[PDB]
Amino acid sequence: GKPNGIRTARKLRSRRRVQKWADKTYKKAHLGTRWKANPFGGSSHAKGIVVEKLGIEAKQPNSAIRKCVRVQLIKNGKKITAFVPRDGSLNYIDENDEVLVAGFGRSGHAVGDPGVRFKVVKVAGASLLALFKEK
Amino acid sequence: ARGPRKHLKRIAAPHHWMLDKLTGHYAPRPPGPHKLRESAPLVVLLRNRLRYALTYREVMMIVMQRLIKVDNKVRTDQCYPAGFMDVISIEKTKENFRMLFDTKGRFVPHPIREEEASYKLCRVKKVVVGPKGVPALITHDGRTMRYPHPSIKAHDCIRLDLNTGKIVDTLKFEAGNMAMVTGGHNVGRVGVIVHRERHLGGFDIIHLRDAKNNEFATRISNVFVIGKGEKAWISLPKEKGIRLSIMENRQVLLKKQQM
Amino acid sequence: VQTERAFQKQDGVSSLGRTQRYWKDVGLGFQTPRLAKESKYVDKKCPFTGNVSIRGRVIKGMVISTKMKRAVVIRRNYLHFVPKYSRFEKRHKNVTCHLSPCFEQVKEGDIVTAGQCRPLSKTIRFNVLKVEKNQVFGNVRKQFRLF
Amino acid sequence: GISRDRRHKHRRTGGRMPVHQKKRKFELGRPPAMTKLGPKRVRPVRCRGGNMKYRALRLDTGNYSWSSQKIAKKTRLLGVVYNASNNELVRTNTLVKNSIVAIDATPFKAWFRSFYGLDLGHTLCLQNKHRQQGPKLDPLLEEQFNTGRLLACISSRPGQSGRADGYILEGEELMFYKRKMDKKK
RNA sequence: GAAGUUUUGUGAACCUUAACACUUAGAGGAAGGAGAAGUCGUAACAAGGUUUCCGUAGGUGAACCUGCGGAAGGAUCAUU
RNA sequence: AAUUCUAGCAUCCUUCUGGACUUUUACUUUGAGAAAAUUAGAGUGUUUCAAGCAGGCUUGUCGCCUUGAAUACUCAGCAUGGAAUAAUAAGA
RNA sequence: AAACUGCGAAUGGCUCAUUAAAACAGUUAUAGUUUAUUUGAUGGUCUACAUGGAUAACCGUGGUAAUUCUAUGGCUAAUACCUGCGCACAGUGUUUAUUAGAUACAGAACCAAGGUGAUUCAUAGUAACCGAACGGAUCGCGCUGCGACGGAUCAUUCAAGUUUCUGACCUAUCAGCUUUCGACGGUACUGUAAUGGACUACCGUGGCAGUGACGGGUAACGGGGAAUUAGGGUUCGAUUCCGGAGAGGGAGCCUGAGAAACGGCUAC
């Protein structure tokens, strides 16, 4: 078991700082690789230009073509695929049009039906909800 | 950095002035006889205790009349550090204020008689020989009385005359002599002196006993002898430095406010 | 004795006194040793023989080496509390420290009390006041005593 | 300029010390005046406080106290004879503290004739009284006087004061430095 | 007491070499996972049709196979 | 009479008129000293409230409440009462 | 008005790039030191009915494309600048030498008294040293009062500089660092406002490290604090206050009580 005795501060204190790294979520915080990894800069949102309009298919069981966009972040010019929320709206994007990118809400990882971690919040600053609504 | 700071800030002021949080970003800054945190400037007497002035402007209009004196001497500077056991004298109204410590730990101008307002006490910091082999006291006030008695030692008070320069009445520092506290936790408390411990190296401390038989301690720098074993050279403020308890200070206060 | 290039002489004694020896009384409840008074050594930096006040702090500890000349180094030990785990932790600091040649035969692993003074060199701030003989077996740096 | 601070140079562990501050005027030093023999010159250096500190550059003369007899005379210097620290300072005749120097000895010889009247080579009563009161003179000082020279330690710091003062060597100090003069010979 | 000047120290800036740090191109090689459905077997799960598995060694289109010593997580808690 | 603390007497020091000795610390207790703001908190109808540190009585005029704005909090370091516990010292 | 002189401009304000026993925090020390100003002290001792000659603004007058650039010529001031007698050999200060600075007990015979836990402290005395510093060539209201300014030493106050002890995030795919060119110590200078390898001569061989030295990372200024609904904790703190550092990058320096200053100057 543990060492209980009054003078065992080092062994107790050393064991935590070593075996904190066994957590998956602790490493994603506290390593230096967070800053190089992600296309985002430890940031909530990021603008970019739509290099291409793209279509991808959801993994079974679900089948369909999901309509996403490939974008280059302005700061790093790093390509990413951002899903476009709601019906249609693909027409709205226009190649070479600036689009806001937001996290899919899963802290990267993946969402539901492959390998996409971002969602386009706004197009030309208009935003997706306003147009789908038409308000 | 680089030199002395000409501003002081509100909040970073002493608490025992009781300047408020709003209604100013800065606070008046007091160098004179006394220290910064063991004194009170002449502005916050006039506006924030005695309530003669409203504003900082009006204190200049009072003080440049040459109406205010301290120690029978006219001080024109509005930010003059007027500290513990200084007399203030205004000729219009014909009333005089000796600054003592209140029991809570505040400055308060205690009003006094005209004959009493001549003299004041100065506890001597040390005694030292000047040039031509002449002896000389130095005080907490930063006066330097010269040709004393050989009797007079360190850490004890002398009644100054003020009308003239010279000393009049000594006092000794011993067991069974009345003693106010000027700083620390037990400030504003007056009691006879029971005993002092030496501790040969640094910081002598004194245990001493309130007139309701409460016992409490302070360092010797804070302790300031008033007078003999019972009785006192000076007049004391309200409560005479008892410091009644927290529940007592509650009970007396709310009993007052119902009228 | 005149070891060195300059004439080693005790300040305090004037050239009129050339028999007389100066010895200070350091105070603070510390008695002057007899070998300071009787012997003929100089030392500028001795508490009892030369110009150095002792003032401020006083530090006890275990001597860990006596190799460098007219100076020792004194291992202080202490427990450090760690408030999460509610539990102590053994640390140390090697204070380097002057000593005077009145103290004959200052062995390794002796107890020594040492007062603070003005900085005599870079590393040493403290000066010795008094020593005590005790044996310690094996390594000295292993030996934990708290004082 | 010359930084006196400890922010440069190593720790006791052997580790570089981080420095995040530029040099500070209160961490000042200045170039050392290696003052010497020659006709007098002296330069007032304005220091911290406003207070002046007078840098010696050449000094001919000085006030030197004979200890036993309890008198002091203004006297010219001849040469720097020994130094404990550095042999280069003797080579150039550079006056510093603790530096052993040659001295005229005609002020003391004139005094010793006038005061006592034993000499070297109505009052009379006063002289006799002085003699009884205080004149045997060491055997080595007797030989030393015959040359027309004495030996003396510089006691003042010339760089700070702007002044060579000292005291005459006598007894054990005199016997000591006569070894290490003769040893190099 | 000016310009100029002698020797020192303080010393920016630039350059050569080297090391360390951090991004980054690369013919070819060779991993892992993803498709969504293909070709060739049949290895494991039942004694899975040669019980399964370990360490080590050699061999073969591929799963795999065999040698030596172990384990039951075996298909036996068991018979002069 | 419970619950605290304390003197004696069963062989219990003394050098003096409170401190010196009882191996040494840790530990615990009380005390010193430690800026305010913030935080908890005493008092008070900012109309309530977040707040703020103000106010409250009253045809009296050198106005009064000898007006209030309390108090706590701030490892290592300095000091002290103490019989356990645990280190540590030793072994006239 | 203008101009000279004095004082201020080193505070305040802004920012967080540096920086990991560094800074900072609480806690000491300064017997190891500087301090404009404030407050209180002190002091006859060295043509004395009064010493000297230049400088603005101003007037005359130009230069240059241009500026908070300024030259030549002519006047005139001082609390600017510089000199400088004096009892009622001979003061105070500086620099060295050096005596006293007593203290657990009473005395007897013989001859020629400050102050600290603590000092080389205060102070007095003796013998000389230097000019490089004080001992008022100043101003207003009214035999005689009041206070403005100047300046020395000693306290005092606003400070500042060092300084004792203890305290921090990750990393061992960083285990041995430091040194002849100061690493640790010793003696004697030098230098500083003073203490010091702070620096220079010689001399010794030390110092730190498995309780994490040395090195690397930080999307690191530190703390007072902030968020978080048992207790214990975990994460944040550029940002109202207190320290610290910096003014594009580094370095150097003048003036002053105080700056290595940048709403000051010199260089790359």
Q: Give the domain ranges of chain A.
A: 1-135
Report CA(D175)–C1'(G112) in Å, whole number.
Answer: 34
Burial of B110 (0-12, 13-18, 19+ CB in 10 A): middle
Residue B137 lies in a domain: yes
Helix axes D139-146, D172-182, angle to 10 degrees: 60
Residue B172 CB contacts under 8 Å (≥ 6 apart), including other chains:
B153, B156, B225
Rg (CA), chain B: 19
Burial of A83 (0-12, 13-18, 19+ CB in 10 A): middle
Contacts 24+ apart (CB under 8 A), D65-69: D65/D165, D65/D166, D65/D167, D65/D168, D66/D108, D66/D167, D66/D168, D66/D170, D67/C14, D67/C15, D67/C16, D67/D167, D67/D168, D67/D170, D68/C15, D68/C16, D68/D170, D69/D134
Q: Are B216 and B208 in contact (CB under 8 A)?
A: yes
Residue A28 CB contacts under 8 Å (≥ 6 apart), including other chains:
A34
Least CA distance to A13: which residue of chain C?
A: C85
Residue B149 lies in a domain: yes
Rg (CA), chain A: 21
Separation between Cα atoms, residue C113 and residue C103, nearest integer Å: 12
Q: Do B50 and B110 share a domain, yes or no? A: yes
Separation between Cα atoms, residue A118 and residue A120, nearest integer Å: 7
Angle in degrees, CA B72, B77, B82, rounded to 5: 60
Residue B128 lies in a domain: yes
- Protein residue closest via CA to C1' of G17: D20
Residue B250 lies in a domain: no
Reported CATH class of domain D106-148? mainly alpha
Q: Do B92 and B190 share a domain, yes or no? A: no
Angle in degrees, CA B203, C55, C91, rounded to 5: 95
Q: Do B110 and B1 share a domain, yes or no? A: yes
Q: Chain-centre distance of CA A71, in angstroms?
A: 13
The alpha carbon torsion through C44, C47, C52, C56 (nearest 10 deg) reads: 150
Nearest to C6 by CA among D68, D97, D185, D37: D97
Q: Are A111 and A102 in contact (CB under 8 A)?
A: no
> What is the CATH number for B8?
3.10.290.10
Q: Do B19 and B109 share a domain, yes or no? A: yes
Q: Which of B98, B115, B132 is the last residue of a domain?
A: B115
According to DSSP, the residues that pair with D54 across neighbouring strands are D44
Residue B255 lies in a domain: no
Residue B75 structure tokens: 């001080």
Quick one: residue D49, left, alpha or beta (phi over 0 = left, psi -120 to 50 = alpha)? left
Residue B92 lies in a domain: yes
Separation between Cα atoms, residue D101 and residue D180, nearest integer Å: 14
Q: Chain-centre distance of CA B101, in angstroms?
A: 6
Residue C3 structure tokens: 């070891």
3-state SS class at D49 = helix
DSSP D152: E
Residues of chain A numbered 13-32 and touching chain C (CB < 8 Å): 13
Nearest to A69 by CA among A88, A50, A86: A50
Least CA distance to D6: which residue of chain C?
A: C122
Q: Do B166 and B177 share a domain, yes or no? A: no
3-state SS class at C4 = coil
Residue A122 structure tokens: 């706004």
Resolution (A): 3.3
- Give the method of determination: cryo-EM
Residue B248 lies in a domain: no
Separation between Cα atoms, residue B59 and residue B52, nearest integer Å: 9
Residue B219 CB contacts under 8 Å (≥ 6 apart), including other chains:
B184, B203, B204, B205, B206
Separation between Cα atoms, residue B239 and residue B248, nearest integer Å: 13
Q: Please state whether the peptide bond connecting residue B41 to the residue before it is cis, i.e. omega within 30 degrees of 0.
A: no
Residue B28 structure tokens: 């008046």
Quick one: residue B64, left, alpha or beta (phi over 0 = left, psi -120 to 50 = alpha)? alpha
Residues of chain C numbered 79-98 and touching chain D (CB < 8 Å): 96
Is the CB of D172 inside 8 Å of chain C's CB atoms?
Answer: yes
Q: Are B78 and B69 in contact (CB under 8 A)?
A: no
Report CA(B202)–C1'(G209) in Å, whole number.
Answer: 37
Partners of D173 on chain C (C-beta within 8 Å) are: 7, 9, 15
Q: Which helix (H) or strand (E) holds B126?
A: strand B120-129
Report CA(D8)–C1'(G217) in Å, whole number.
Answer: 24
Separation between Cα atoms, residue B151 and residue D74, nearest integer Å: 47
Q: Do B2 and B108 share a domain, yes or no? A: yes
A-C CB pairs within 8 A amount to: 23
DSSP C56: S
Separation between Cα atoms, residue D64 and residue D47, nearest integer Å: 28
Residue B12 structure tokens: 């970073």
Q: Are D46 and D52 in contact (CB under 8 A)?
A: yes
Our count of domains for chain B comes to: 3
End-to-end CA distance of chain D: 42
Partners of A20 on chain C (C-beta within 8 Å) are: none
Q: Do A7 and C80 touch (CB under 8 A)?
A: no
Pick from C5, C7, C122: CB nearest D173: C7
Q: Do B105 and B199 share a domain, yes or no? A: no
> What is the CATH number for B141?
2.40.50.740
| Amino acid, single-letter form, for residue A85 | P
DSSP C120: S
| Amino acid, single-letter form, for residue C71 | A
Residue B216, nucleotide of least CA–C1' distance:
F31
In this complex, whether A and D touch, counting 3 or more CB pairs under 8 angstroms, is: no
Q: Do B161 and B184 share a domain, yes or no? A: no
According to DSSP, the residues that pair with D74 across neighbouring strands are D63
Report CA(A15)–C1'(F89) in Å, whole number.
Answer: 36
Q: Are C70 and C101 in contact (CB under 8 A)?
A: yes
Q: Are B146 and B137 in contact (CB under 8 A)?
A: yes
DSSP B169: E
Residues in chain B followed by a break, C to N above 2.5 angstroms: 30
Q: Are B119 and B161 in contact (CB under 8 A)?
A: yes
Q: Do B141 and B48 share a domain, yes or no? A: no
Range of the domain at B136: 120-170
Q: Are B127 and B135 in contact (CB under 8 A)?
A: yes
The runs of H, that is alpha helices, within chain C are: 34-38
The alpha carbon of residue B39 is apart from the nearest alpha carbon of chain C, in Å, by: 29
Residue C118 structure tokens: 């003005």
Residue A116 structure tokens: 């996409």
Separation between Cα atoms, residue D168 and residue D100, nearest integer Å: 10
Q: Do B10 and B110 share a domain, yes or no? A: yes
Nearest to B186 by CA among B150, B154, B212, B223: B223
Q: Which helix (H) or strand (E) holds B250?
A: helix B246-257
The alpha carbon of residue A19 is apart from the nearest alpha carbon of chain C, in Å, by: 16
Q: Please state whether the peptide bond connecting residue A61 to the residue before it is cis, i.e. omega within 30 degrees of 0.
A: yes
Rg (CA), chain D: 22
3-state SS class at A84 = coil
How many other C-beta atoms can be found within 10 angstroms of the C-beta atom of residue B127? 15
Separation between Cα atoms, residue D77 and residue D165, nearest integer Å: 11
3-state SS class at B98 = strand
3-state SS class at A79 = strand
**Sign (positive/negative) of CA torsion D17, D22, D24, D28?**
positive
Partners of A7 on chain C (C-beta within 8 Å) are: 79, 87-90
Partners of A12 on chain C (C-beta within 8 Å) are: 82, 85, 87
According to DSSP, the residues that pair with B177 across neighbouring strands are B228
Angle in degrees, CA A83, A87, A89, rounded to 5: 65
Q: Where in chain D is the domain with CATH 1.10.168.20?
A: 106-148
Is the CB of C40 inside 8 Å of chain D's CB atoms?
Answer: no
Residue B98 lies in a domain: yes
